[PDB]
A = this chain, B = another copy of it.
């Protein structure tokens, strides 16, 4: 309500949960005038100023104003251990600097419980069938759910937003629609869940009479 305004978004859950990826916190300044084109960002991790952020190139919004975005890459462990990320924004149209802070949801982590369901007898009169994955009992709400078969990703799924349950955990459901034939032919499908409360240092390779 009145000035250029700032919003501060956390990383994608998938990015926080795969050590191979690069999670980032994103600081977005909107409603900046052509009069005052330039914006200065200062970034802090638990109050200590850090220097690795990258400002994306500013770009005119169709309502005359500019939108400027700074992204800060965060360390996998730092984010999940609860460090606080602050974005401070400075601008000629803005008599005092504005600051916003973000960090991971606080509270005891709770492990998702995962249940799958094959299509109904009803469901299988159609050319497509839907496979269901119910995921309950998790905290915090940040989660990523995907599907695979035969070591390859299956992307024709829809997943609901986590809904808070009666016990303070979250719940969601994912549905993957495939060709009935693919299901009929005995292909195995996998609902894959990534969540901070799953935590392991394990892989495996399997062998059979082939």
Contacts and interface: CB of A to CB of B under 8 A. Distances in A.
Interface of A: 17-19, 42, 48-52, 106, 112, 114-118, 131, 133, 148, 183-196, 198-210
Contacts of A199: 19, 200-201
Given A49-B50, A49-B51, A189 B203 contact: no
A133 B206 CA distance: 10
Given A19-B199, A199-B19, A200-B200, A205 B183 contact: no
Contacts of A184: 209
How many copies of this protein are present in the complex?
Answer: 6
Contacts of A106: 106
A17 B201 CA distance: 6
Given A49-B51, A50-B49, A183 B209 contact: yes
Contacts of A50: 49
Given A49-B51, A50-B49, A116 B205 contact: yes
20 contacts: A17-B201, A17-B202, A18-B201, A42-B52, A114-B203, A114-B205, A116-B205, A118-B209, A118-B210, A186-B209, A187-B208, A188-B208, A189-B206, A189-B207, A190-B205, A192-B204, A194-B201, A198-B200, A198-B203, A199-B201
